Amino acid sequence: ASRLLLNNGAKMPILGLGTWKSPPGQVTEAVKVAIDVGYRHIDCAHVYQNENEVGVAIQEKLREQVVKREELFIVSKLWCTYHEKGLVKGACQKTLSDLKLDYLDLYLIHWPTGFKPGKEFFPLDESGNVVPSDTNILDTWAAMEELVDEGLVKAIGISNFNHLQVEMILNKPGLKYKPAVNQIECHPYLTQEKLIQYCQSKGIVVTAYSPLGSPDRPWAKPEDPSLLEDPRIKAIAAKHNKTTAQVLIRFPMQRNLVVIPKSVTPERIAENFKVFDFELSSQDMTTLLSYNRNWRVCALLSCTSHKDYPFHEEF
Ligand SMILES: NC(=O)c1ccc[n+]([C@@H]2O[C@H](COP(=O)([O-])OP(=O)(O)OC[C@H]3O[C@@H](n4cnc5c(N)ncnc54)[C@H](OP(=O)(O)O)[C@@H]3O)[C@@H](O)[C@H]2O)c1
Ligand SMILES: C[As](C)(=O)[O-]
């Protein structure tokens, strides 16, 4: 619909607003405009360094009575430096403070890789490599389940997990809460048919990130492919009298995925919301799928030898 049922009984808005790369000086206004426009789902993370400013916008709109809190669906993520059992509740409460909420709707493990705790988000050794924690996925999962029993979060999930890492949690002895959601990269150049089939067969909702190809990723190279400018995708958009961004947002929706485009620009935030009024045909869908080239925006290239690096497995 406009909302999908999670395995905890709550319903997640199929469209949300992303906030990675959203400057602290612009994001409060961006989230205020989104909520005005009809967004009810905001994707956040501590590592984005803008949760305080996101929270100012949420507070203003609650105070104004534009939305009730129970109508909002607010998501954040546990960063890699807080995977230790004793650091997890603390990371969560910090995010809750910044956002000025008393619970999250969904809390995700941001990446499966744990790093050494500290103030640096990517701790480097003297050789400049990332320092790993010796924690594993299962112990971090048990700390996350705690958060649900304490009332801090309603649902817990994972992000950038491959299918064997998901398996690992599902087979955990004494598993109390299943992951509700696996948030992964997904667009016409990285279609994820195998992992999406796997998660959906297990009752795990998939959220597509970087749906537009992340044209503002800080590592962008000029030779690099561009989804928004692909003439094949422009043609499908023209047929439907929509923009190529609106086609790229509608595509995961028809695959029963949640999608979270990022924008700090009021007219684009508005434009990105107008995707409930049209339908891609099944020929269009099959065509977009055929464009897959296994191209990833986010490959976490500094952690390619971490014991828990997710992207050595096929799916
Ligand atoms: N879990 C993870 O590891 C992870 C990783 C990456 C992303 N995500 C989440 O997914 C969100 C989305 O992915 P993303 O931020 O990489 O990129 P994206 O949503 O694929 O693209 C954002 C870029 O596209 C532009 N854009 C938005 N609407 C547009 C439109 N209608 N027409 C033209 N350009 C448009 C934005 O410009 P303006 O802002 O200038 O308007 C921004 O430059 C993130 O913000 C984050 O919340 C999660
Ligand atoms: C690309 As990210 C900052 O959501 O790990």
From Swiss-Prot:
Tissue specificity is: Highly expressed in embryonic epithelial cells (EUE) in response to osmotic stress.
Which is an annotated GO molecular function term of this record? glyceraldehyde oxidoreductase activity
Where, by residue number, does NADP(+) bind?
A: 9-18, 210-272
Q: Can you name this protein?
A: Aldo-keto reductase family 1 member B1
What does the UniProt entry say about where the protein is found?
Cytoplasm
Binding site residues for substrate: 110
Q: Which residues carry this modification: Phosphoserine?
A: 2
Source organism's superkingdom?
A: Eukaryota
Assembly and oligomerization: Monomer.
What is the native source organism of this protein? Answer: Homo sapiens
Extract the InterPro entries matched here. Answer: AKR, Aldo/ket_reductase_CS, NADP_OxRdtase_dom, NADP_OxRdtase_dom_sf
